[PDB]
Amino acid sequence: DPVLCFTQYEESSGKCKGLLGGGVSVEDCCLNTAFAYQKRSGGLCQPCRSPRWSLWSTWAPCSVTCSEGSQLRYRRCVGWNGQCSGKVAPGTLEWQLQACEDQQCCPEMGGWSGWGPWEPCSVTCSKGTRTRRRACNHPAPKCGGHCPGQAQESEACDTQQVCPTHGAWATWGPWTPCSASCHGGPHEPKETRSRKCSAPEPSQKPPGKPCPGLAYEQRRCTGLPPCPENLYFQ
Numbered sequence: 001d002p003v004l005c006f007t008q009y010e011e012s013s014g015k016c017k018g019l020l021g022g023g024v025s026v027e028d029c030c031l032n033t034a035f036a037y038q039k040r041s042g043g044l045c046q047p048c049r050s051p052r053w054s055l056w057s058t059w060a061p062c063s064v065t066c067s068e069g070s071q072l073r074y075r076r077c078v079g080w081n082g083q084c085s086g087k088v089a090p091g092t093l094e095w096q097l098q099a100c101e102d103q104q105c106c107p108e109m110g111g112w113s114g115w116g117p118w119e120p121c122s123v124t125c126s127k128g129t130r131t132r133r134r135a136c137n138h139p140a141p142k143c144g145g146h147c148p149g150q151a152q153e154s155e156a157c158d159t160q161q162v163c164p165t166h167g168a169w170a171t172w173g174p175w176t177p178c179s180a181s182c183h184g185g186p187h188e189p190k191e192t193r194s195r196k197c198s199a200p201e202p203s204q205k206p207p208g209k210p211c212p213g214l215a216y217e218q219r220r221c222t223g224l225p226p227c228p229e230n231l232y233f234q
């Protein structure tokens with residue numbers, strides 16, 4: 001039966017390279033054992049060399065991306081007029097099966113436990129948020145698993161309580177004139193300053209914290225001349 005006669009067998013890919021033409025017998029084509037033949041463009045290029053096992057193909061992908069699996073690789077008997085090792089005809093296949101492990105551990109998600117009690121409201125006046133929480137330990141997840149859903153729920157709470165307004169000091173008033181025009185006399189020269197607790201005034205309705213500290217300041221007046229000695233004659 002005539003066949004397509006190719007001048008080269010690639011071997012790296014099992015392709016029939018360099019077509020010499022068709023309409024010639026297999027015996028004539030394979031006078032040169034370096035040539036090769038196939039039937040039409042259907043494929044399966046067989047070299048004219050004596051039959052010999054090809055190379056083991058690369059390992060197929062593991063049957064599962066999880067835990068232990070199994071992967072194959074093939075090797076084809078290629079040639080003409082004879083047999084490969086195994087009482088094998090040209091064209092047959094030989095397989096090797098191997099235990100593979102893409103990932104050594106398969107994630108199994110867990111289950112939620114009971115909901116924890118609702119925490120109190122996040123604030124004691126005006127409005128805040130209320131939160132309850134649970135654990136992912138019934139059962140606990142294995143590997144990188146995780147329970148389905150959220151581990152905590154939150155929701156708004158209204159305290160029905162007007163917030164108290166706290167007081168803060170207004171700006172400092174002006175300095176008073178000094179108590180004296182000189183230092184060294186009966187009373188040292190002192191300066192005074194005062195401020196109001198009106199920015200903002202506290203409480204309003206519920207009690208508010210009063211303004212912290214003092215509403216006044218005292219200091220010595222510096223830079224004054226010395227008073228004369230009014231106790232004996234100079």
Ligand SMILES: *[C@@H]1O[C@@H](C)[C@@H](O)[C@@H](O[C@@H]2O[C@H](CO)[C@@H](O)[C@H](O)[C@H]2O)[C@@H]1O
Pocket residue numbers: 064065066106107
């Ligand atoms: C390859 O990657 C892994 C991380 C998994 O997602 C594989 O899918 C499958 O996941 C389920 C869990 O629901 C396991 O029980 C399966 O055995 C695993 O094949 C994925 O194909």
Ligand SMILES: *[C@@H]1O[C@@H](C)[C@@H](O)[C@@H](O[C@@H]2O[C@H](CO)[C@@H](O)[C@H](O)[C@H]2O)[C@@H]1O
Pocket residue numbers: 123124125161163164166
């Ligand atoms: C809880 O009880 C209420 C009656 C208030 O006294 C709360 O104090 C206020 O809390 C708010 C917001 O958390 C602050 O802005 C106020 O300054 C503070 O007085 C209290 O926590």
Ligand SMILES: *[C@@H]1O[C@@H](C)[C@@H](O)[C@@H](O[C@@H]2O[C@H](CO)[C@@H](O)[C@H](O)[C@H]2O)[C@@H]1O
Pocket residue numbers: 180181182185186225227228230
């Ligand atoms: C204010 O101006 C000063 C320059 C002085 O003339 C002062 O007089 C002195 O005041 C002190 C007490 O602060 C008295 O002891 C002295 O008798 C007096 O000379 C002035 O008051």
Ligand SMILES: *[C@H]1O[C@H](CO)[C@@H](O)[C@H](O)[C@@H]1O
Pocket residue numbers: 054055056057
């Ligand atoms: C397959 O197996 C071994 C190692 O891969 C070698 O004999 C040769 O590569 C064969 O094709």
Ligand SMILES: *[C@H]1O[C@H](CO)[C@@H](O)[C@H](O)[C@@H]1O
Pocket residue numbers: 057058059060
């Ligand atoms: C399978 O085995 C190793 C890698 O696991 C390599 O020789 C090659 O990738 C083959 O397909």
Ligand SMILES: *[C@H]1O[C@H](CO)[C@@H](O)[C@H](O)[C@@H]1O
Pocket residue numbers: 110111112113147148149
């Ligand atoms: C936790 O959440 C719900 C039940 O509240 C379910 O999706 C499941 O039981 C999960 O473990």
Ligand SMILES: *[C@H]1O[C@H](CO)[C@@H](O)[C@H](O)[C@@H]1O
Pocket residue numbers: 113114115
């Ligand atoms: C928490 O929420 C409700 C009860 O409040 C139920 O779905 C279940 O008990 C969960 O643990």
Ligand SMILES: *[C@H]1O[C@H](CO)[C@@H](O)[C@H](O)[C@@H]1O
Pocket residue numbers: 116117118132
């Ligand atoms: C919070 O909500 C109610 C009480 O307001 C109850 O179902 C339970 O105490 C939950 O933790």
Ligand SMILES: *[C@H]1O[C@H](CO)[C@@H](O)[C@H](O)[C@@H]1O
Pocket residue numbers: 167168169170211212213
């Ligand atoms: C006034 O006093 C101090 C600042 O000096 C603080 O307690 C606060 O700012 C108050 O209003």
Ligand SMILES: *[C@H]1O[C@H](CO)[C@@H](O)[C@H](O)[C@@H]1O
Pocket residue numbers: 170171172
């Ligand atoms: C009074 O004193 C100083 C200077 O003015 C500042 O701390 C602030 O203005 C306060 O009211």
Ligand SMILES: *[C@H]1O[C@H](CO)[C@@H](O)[C@H](O)[C@@H]1O
Pocket residue numbers: 172173174175193
């Ligand atoms: C008192 O001191 C000086 C005035 O000499 C100014 O910084 C300000 O008026 C303050 O109240």
